[PDB]
Subunit: 238 residues, 5 copies
């Protein structure tokens, strides 16, 4: 019900937590593991009131990463308590943190200066799909960029948006403002059913001016499949 | 009593030590951990005469980090003695050092050359708050910066303060001069109850001239919650 | 049967998975290992319907890497499901992931602008050989490159083809377009029976203009021997 | 007999493999160590037909390295099989691979354009010595260098050779061409009885123009003592 | 007796060895540990003819480092044997190698071209003190520096010496020429009783031209306390 309430509002913190599994985890009986999976499910259900948790399977698509959480919360204190509780489960005890990124969702600052045709088209964001591919790309801008004026940056983002137009429906997008909460300026997140499309999207965006100013682009580039927490957890219990 | 002499005086060394918990710590009985946690509590109280020790929960906010200490001492040999004992406890035996940074506090070198109105406001530094967020950011400047004359750097630093003024109350700050004691020139430390404020603070500072001259900014950016040592250790002993 | 249709078609995903073996793997009886190798072979034929899996021996030629897979699939979900199961085997359980790269094969975009003499020559691609050396070289182009026009980029690739012509026969080649699926823009793959030929090819390509615009070239440079799954597995069961 | 044929011919592959000893090696009885040592001692004798293996003591001179092999072979498949067999022994089982580099020996490409005086002096290469120091320095040249024409590059190498002339006898030298076989362009190898001579040589070579064009110089720089395999392993069985 | 001859003479090698203590060292009875302490003491006493061994406590001041040796020898092979022998002791069995650097002492090469006041002032080097702080800073110069002539570098080094004059007495200094023996050109070593003094020294040196030409400055900067081997080991025999 309130899953759409956090996924759209401004001032909401999004956290991306990556985890890897110790090898001696498979040296455990399938029954100890089945119990450990139930513990995790109960915990997220317990937190289903304060925070929203979506889970992704990174195992086999991203190196040194088996699982990712995307946590939405009004305060990172909530995220901290939940993540700390998660790593405390018997499943969590066997997990190695492989990355942690935070960012807050905001209302667009440049869209207001775009052509109205571009504004209205931007009201489209992805399309209905089951178990889509998900990509997360952390971004650090070089310092020279922040010297530019509001008009110039508005221009760069329109050039940016213009190249991305063909993918409004076929590629869902989300942006998190991350500067000061970690070592990057932005966290970018995308959903898609066709990876060949997303590839062309990033390839198209490489042709604009804005792209020349990335100190960090990827590193890591997280690639996974969006899946119910149930299905992912099952894969760890055989 | 003298807890405030260390947090405010000049010539006081601040050391930041971050720790990650080994997985085989969870292979220990809750009985041994409660005993091991008791060991650490006594040690800091034992050292409660010469140095000040503050603990932070980094687990769930920073990757590869569960705990951080901020230790203040008049001589770094004392800090050395304390940490060496801490890492010797059974809790310490299972901890992986994730970084160790030192810096000394000083009297401002540029503030004297600021406008007097700006001087007086700088006398404001944070506000009363309970269990605040804490951010630690190591900073390395590129070499050309040190070539500039004192007047130019005063100008850079004034532009720096000018952008930071709106956050004097909502963001407490402290600076440690670290060059020669490790691989960074400064350690920056901040407390806040509002991360979105601290975020906006760094965004404002990214727009000034001095910012263009950072060889290293972050790496790591430490984010945690300030908490009594008791509560932190508690979380690891169940 | 249809294995060359994937190795040649466009819209086919190529994934490169590298593995190192844990030391505690050899503390197992030679009897258990053979059983575990048995576990792996059944899996590849079980997936031999949905995906193509080729295996390479990297042990002794590449540092910190013992095994590599080259998986071709219609969808990366298939690769993920296979790989997630593979690392789940009792053999995989003792394997440390050393890298994962994805890329899609496409029809040439620049060749159409080549001389007819050069185009026809390009239809030659490697030659018949047994258990050839294999090389994988990930590539990231710098951002300034993507600003150039189609004509300029066409010229650079013609000059590129021109220098590589002598190796059409002695060096099999394949290119994967990877941008957005990981931290590189291209994955290049080669088969050859004479490493000094492939060497002369790469020193020759270093002489061209296009070569100066590689932010990342190698890292890692993967060198291994192409072998049936049967022969490689032998080496971990001794 | 053919011991000098491999160390002098062109078309010979030189591979450098460094190893470190695990701590759990000492948790074995002194007889278990002697059995593992005899196994390795025996294994090299077995490969003494196809390839030449020279052993170096890096323990105490290079960090995270106790042993280095220098293997010469007409084909790298032999080297792979040998190293893969070595890493399989119970001694090797306790070993951590610390680096692996390949390169081919060639006949000089620039010397032909040198003064007859330089050619004749270059016929000097080292001197008679027992258990000499050995240094390995991997080199990556930057892309601009390969853009240069053959005449200009010949001049750079002459200026290069000229500074090196005083050390022809007291420092043995060998060059391996490595491009495409790994992430570096050259592998350099040296023997000497007086390290301060070799030091002065490297300082002397730092003064020429060509030196400014190394993207990578060292990393790692390997320092060890040339010693029979016999004495090296002996040191591990007490 | 000759302890002062080695610490001052030219042609003497200084080696810096870092060690970290294994966790399983504390799982031994305090009595078993004491024998190892006598074992090492006996070992150093045995080498007291050929080499000088000084010990430092890095634990609690340097990250990933508990102990450091500074070994002086007329030949580097002897250092190899002692270190190779030392890491073999039951103390050595529990020690983890953490870094290794070598360098040779020389007669000053630039000082002769200084003003005589600067020459005479330079004969001051530290002061009598017990258990001083010690700092080690590895240095790699960028290639352009070595292109400069003897006169120009003399000018650079004078400017360097000039900024350092205030610290002649309060900071002892020593310089090792390291090129070719590892990945750095120089190893710098300092003793001081006042770290804030050494800090001000490095801040002062950052302002001269020479500082801008460091490819590598620090990484790591080692910080520890000079202490007798006996007292340090006792701390490990508790
Ligand atoms: C796929 C469809 C996309 C659309 C329609 C789109 C459009 C936009 C728009 C309108 C903004 C302005 C935000 C604002 O005004 O507050 C923006 C910002 C941004 N986008 Fe995209 N974008 C797309 C894809 C991407 C991709 C693939 C990336 C990176 C891989 C990306 C990275 C960014 C970044 C870093 C910003 C913030 C730039 C800044 O504040 O300087 N976007 N995008
Ligand atoms: C309310 C927030 C802040 C205020 C009011 C403030 C103000 C100042 C002032 C007045 C100085 C000069 C001190 C002197 O003259 O010795 C200074 C120094 C410095 N500040 Fe801040 N600052 C704030 C936050 C930050 C933040 C968030 C960072 C980095 C993330 C930062 C980085 C630095 C550094 C590295 C120096 C020393 C630079 C040098 O000495 O060359 N400051 N700050
Ligand atoms: C006999 C050997 C080779 C031949 C004949 C050859 C030829 C070609 C041709 C015809 C293309 C056209 C691509 C297109 O039209 O879309 C191409 C693209 C490309 N090749 Fe090669 N190549 C060879 C080896 C290599 C090697 C060794 C590398 C790198 C180590 C490499 C890197 C690339 C890259 C990155 C592209 C695409 C770059 C871009 O689209 O901007 N090639 N090559
Ligand atoms: C007595 C000492 C030395 C002598 C006599 C010497 C001489 C030479 C000669 C004659 C060549 C020409 C090779 C050719 O024409 O194919 C050469 C190339 C080369 N040397 Fe040395 N050298 C010495 C020391 C060193 C050292 C210490 C290094 C590095 C640490 C080094 C690195 C190289 C490299 C990388 C090349 C090939 C570069 C290229 O082909 O672009 N040399 N040297
Ligand atoms: C009181 C303290 C210091 C004094 C009096 C001093 C003075 C000098 C002098 C006179 C030289 C000339 C050596 C020669 O002629 O061969 C020298 C060399 C050098 N110094 Fe210092 N220095 C001090 C501290 C430092 C520090 C703290 C560093 C780095 C952290 C440093 C880095 C170097 C390096 C790398 C060289 C060798 C450069 C070369 O040979 O080209 N010095 N120093």
């Amino acid at each position: 019900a309130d899953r759409e309430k956090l996924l759209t509002e401004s001032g909401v913190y999004g956290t991306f937590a990556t985890f890897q599994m110790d090898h001696d985890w498979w040296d455990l009986p399938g029954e100890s593991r089945v119990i450990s999976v139930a513990e995790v499910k109960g915990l997220v259900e317990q937190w289903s009131g304060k925070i929203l948790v979506e889970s992704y399977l990174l195992r086999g698509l991203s190196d040194h990463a088996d699982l990712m959480f995307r946590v939405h919360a009004r305060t990172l204190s909530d995220t901290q308590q939940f993540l700390s509780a998660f790593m405390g489960t018997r499943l969590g005890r066997h997990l190695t943190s492989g990355g942690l990124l935070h960012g807050v969702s905001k209302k667009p600052t440049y869209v207001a200066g775009f052509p109205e045709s571009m504004k209205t088209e931007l009201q489209v964001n992805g399309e209905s799909g089951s178990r889509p591919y998900a990509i997360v790309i952390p971004i650090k801008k070089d310092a020279e960029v922040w010297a530019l004026d509001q008009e110039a940056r508005t221009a760069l983002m329109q050039e940016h948006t213009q190249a991305a137009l063909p993918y409004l429906k076929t590629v869902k997008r989300k942006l998190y403002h991350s500067t000061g909460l970690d070592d990057v300026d932005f966290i970018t997140y995308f959903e898609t059913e066709r990876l060949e499309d997303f590839h062309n999207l990033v390839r198209a965006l490489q042709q604009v001016k804005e792209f020349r100013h990335n100190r960090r682009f990827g590193h890591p580039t997280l690639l996974g499949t969006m899946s119910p927490l149930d299905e992912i957890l099952e894969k760890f219990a055989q």
